[model samples]
Target: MRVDELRVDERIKSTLKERGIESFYPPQAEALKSGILEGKNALISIPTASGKTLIAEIAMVHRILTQGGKAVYIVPLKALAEEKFQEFQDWEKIGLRVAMATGDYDSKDEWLGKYDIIIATAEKFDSLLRHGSSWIKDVKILVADEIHLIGSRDRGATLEVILAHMLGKAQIIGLSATIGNPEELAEWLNAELIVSDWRPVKLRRGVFYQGFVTWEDGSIDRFSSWEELVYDAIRKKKGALIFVNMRRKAERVALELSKKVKSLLTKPEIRALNELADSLEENPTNEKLAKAIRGGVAFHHAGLGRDERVLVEENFRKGIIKAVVATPTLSAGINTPAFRVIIRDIWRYSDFGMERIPIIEVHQMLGRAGRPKYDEVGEGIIVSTSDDPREVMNHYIFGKPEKLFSQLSNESNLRSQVLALIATFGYSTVEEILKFISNTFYAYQRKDTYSLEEKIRNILYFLLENEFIEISLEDKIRPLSLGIRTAKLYIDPYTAKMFKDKMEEVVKDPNPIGIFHLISLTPDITPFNYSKREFERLEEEYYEFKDRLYFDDPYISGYDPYLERKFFRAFKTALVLLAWINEVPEGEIVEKYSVEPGDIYRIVETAEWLVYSLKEIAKVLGAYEIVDYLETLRVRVKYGIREELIPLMQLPLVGRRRARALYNSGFRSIEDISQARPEELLKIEGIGVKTVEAIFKFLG
Candidate 1:
């Protein structure tokens, strides 16, 4: 369909024309004709680079222009939330406002009401719903990006429950690149299913054995090695994205590939890469990454800081970088496409030992190949380590994608959702809760919900015994104040009970170590991992802080090995946080903890939230004394500063380093910094003129 022929705003058409999207792709045209713009629900299942996002944009903008209500676009990750937020800002040219929210879980974010479009992550939106945002009633269209994640074991239940909650309230638009069961998913949502195998750029699947690549069309190409193949692609001015199963492998492979990619770079390209490398902030991780970038190649993983990740992505997108060796995190809809995709490791070590990568994920990685704007054909090659190439070809090159299943039956997921149902939605009876559950994809997929019903009954009984919910003589469940606050806080029910139980110990003796330890044990925190070689040192460190820890030594009980490791890891995470709050240097912490700069930031961010949540719970319990201590620790964790620097940190531009400098210079308080002359403050180390102006402006 022609863009000009669509019944949307004239400005939107011009915007699309400006973006060079004059006509819709086959699937996009089908979705438009499928009545998506007329408020009909739709599940658009098509390949990557097929204009799925453009279709959603038309529907959202059309709905708002005609129906005059907000559109909520839900993403799975915070990074993607920001990406879409920036992309959607183009709509502001037509006087439509866009806003994104992915943090501050407890707030209703009422400011978002002013926006015509709101972009948010699933967890954040779920938390917003629990808080009962009043503007939610004004939502007209709910767009779920990567909707196939509803089958994810980690986060699917949350998406399923969110859809279940918003079923009748808003029109749904689910977008996915691959799904084995689009028909069943569409039927569950009562939406039209637009499935297409069309792609703007053709993808050629192949398997690489010892010295030859065998294609699906019975064609073979000879090469010395896969490395040579990647080099040849770079020589042709094409970018290669190599997917590895581990972060360490990604880093090592990128460093090795740089040797070959270096020769392919022109002098101008080398200069550009040098400039890019110099722009990156010097740190332990970035220093190594910079070394690789200088060779026109780079590695990407969660361990790298956000700034470094963005730098790599942008530089590669500009074609200055020839290759990006990345972990699987890059495949989940980040808008970075390449001409060639190399699956270096199809098997990764999981808890179940080494397992083959799922066909869906492999296809997603492969889908990233062949940028529509740049390439006519994309090559996705899998390296076969085994003697037989047919096995690899048959499995990854031609295997069908896995069927989508509901993840709502998980225990911890049910606990959190059931509590929210009662506390926020006023689900008072078993029948009401069951009725709600029946609407979920889980129940729809399974004809018999006998096991789910029994599980729900057990959860209700547990909630009653724990006093989160009380059952009256009439057998109606009602949430207590604790229950209500816990649901609003967006924490698991078991984590809430554990916090309450530990309060007795905290109330008696309050310390930073104790509080940090308590927060790390909660499910909300993803603790740092420790190697088996480092277990002895961790054991010794545990003994060193044993007296102050709220959680006793797991080794003393002689319990299961898994439980013991969990406790030790939590302890190790608490130790890292302790160093952070005590004002240890970031580089020192990274080396000591055997983690990346990105890992430290993630731990600190999550620890900050858990501390803030714990403070809220303490307030709910009326434990006023401990609340003050937690409030102080929250600030410390956030800024990675010592206690005395908190006063200085209140001034604008004064981070941990500058706060320390200001305090050491005798400007200990906000009043002190404000009272000082601009020149006097500028004389302090690490205090620039811009920072001085910001402080004075704040004072004024």
Candidate 2:
């Protein structure tokens, strides 16, 4: 459909035309014509880069303009949320406001009420529902991007439950690629299905063996090696993205590819790549990545920090970096498409030793093959080291992705989701809760609720036994104050119970290490994995700090192996947090803990959230004495500073380094900085006019 012939507002059409989107792709036109703009639910399952996001945006704009209510776009990751938020900012030309919420699960985000377009992660939106945000009731449209993640083991339950709850309440739009059971998903969502194989740029799938890549049509392309293939692609002014199985291999392969990519770079491209390398933070990972970027290549994995990831993605998009070798994490809904997509490893180590990668995951990687407006045709090739490529080609090149399944049957997920249901909706009987569960995709898929009923009853029994819920003689169920608070705090009920059990003992002699250890014991915080040698060191540290730790030896409770491992892992995380709070340098901590800089920030963010929740639990328990201590520890953990630095950290733009610099310069507190002249504060290293102005503004 042409942009002018569409049913949206004139300004929206102008905006689209200005952005060079004057016509819709075939799939997009099909979706728009399917009554999506008339308030009907839609499930558009097509390939990636096929204008799925544009269809959703048009639907959202049409709904908001005609219906005069709010619209929300739900993403599966925080990074995707940010990307959509930035992309949607252009709607301001049509006088529509856009806002993003992915932090602080406890807050209702009432400020979001003023926004015309709201972008959020699935978990964040679920937390908002639990908190009963008033703005949700005004939402007229809900767009779930990457809806196929409902089959994910780790995060699928939340998305599934959200869809279950939002059914029939709002106009739902589900966008995805490569679903084996699109009919099942469409029936579950009660929406029109727009499934197609149409693409703006054609994708050619193939298998590379020995020295030739055999295409699906029996055509062959001969090359000496994978490096030569990449070199040829770069010589044609096309970008390449190589997917590896491991982080170490990502770095290793990138380093090897740099030798081939270096010869094809122009003078300006080389200068720009060198500048990109210089922009990274000073660390071992960044140093290695910088070296690769200097040669017109880079490696990406979860180990790199957020800034480093953004830099790599931006440079790759600009075609300054000729190649990027990354782990599978890069395939998770980020929009950095390439001209040539290479799957280097089809086997990865799992719990059951080495296993072949799933066809669905490989399809997701293949979706990144073609970049719209860049290449006429994209090539997605899988490399085989064995002599025969028939099995690989039959399984991957011509295979269908696996069917989508409901992951809500998981134990921990059921525990948390059930409590949230009872606490938020006040379902007073098992029958009411079952009625809600019957509406889920799980029930629709299985056509049976017998197995789920047993699990629900067991969960209710556990909740009643733990006093999170009460069953009266009349057979009515009610959530106690603890359950309500647990739901509001947006934490697992088991974590709340653990905090309640341990808070009394630790409040008497609260220390940072003890509190961190307690926080790490819960299921919410993820502990770092240790090597055999590091395991021995953790054992010794556990013994040295036995008095400060909260949990006793497993033998004291009759020796359980699971408890012993849990204790060591939690203790190791506690030590890392202790080091973080004691103001250890990030580089030193990275080397000592055998972690990347990104891992540290992720742990610290989770730790801070848990500490805040623990403080709320303390308020419930009436342990007011250690409340101040927990608050200090939360701030210390957040900024990676000591207690003395807390006072200086209150100033605007004053981070850990600046706070420490001011502290060492004798400006110890906000009051001290307020009293000192701006010139004097500027005399200190790293203190500039912009920071001094922020301090003065805070003082005012």
Worst 10 residues of 1 by lDDT: 328-337
Best by lDDT: 1
In candidate 2, which residue ranges exceed 4 Å CA deviation? 386-388, 554-566, 671-677, 693-700
RMSD of candidate 2 to the truth, in angstroms, is: 2.3
The residue pairs that clash in candidate 1, if any, are none
Candidate 2 lDDT score at position 290: 97
Q: State the weakest 10-residue window (summed lDDT) of model 2.
A: 552-561
Q: Estimate the TM-score of every prediction.
A: 0.96, 0.95
lDDT of 1 at 255: 90
The Cα error of candidate 2 at residue 656, in Å, is 0.9
Q: What is the C-alpha RMSD of each candidate to the true structure, in Å?
A: 2.0, 2.3
User: What local lDDT does model 1 show for residue 367?
Assistant: 82
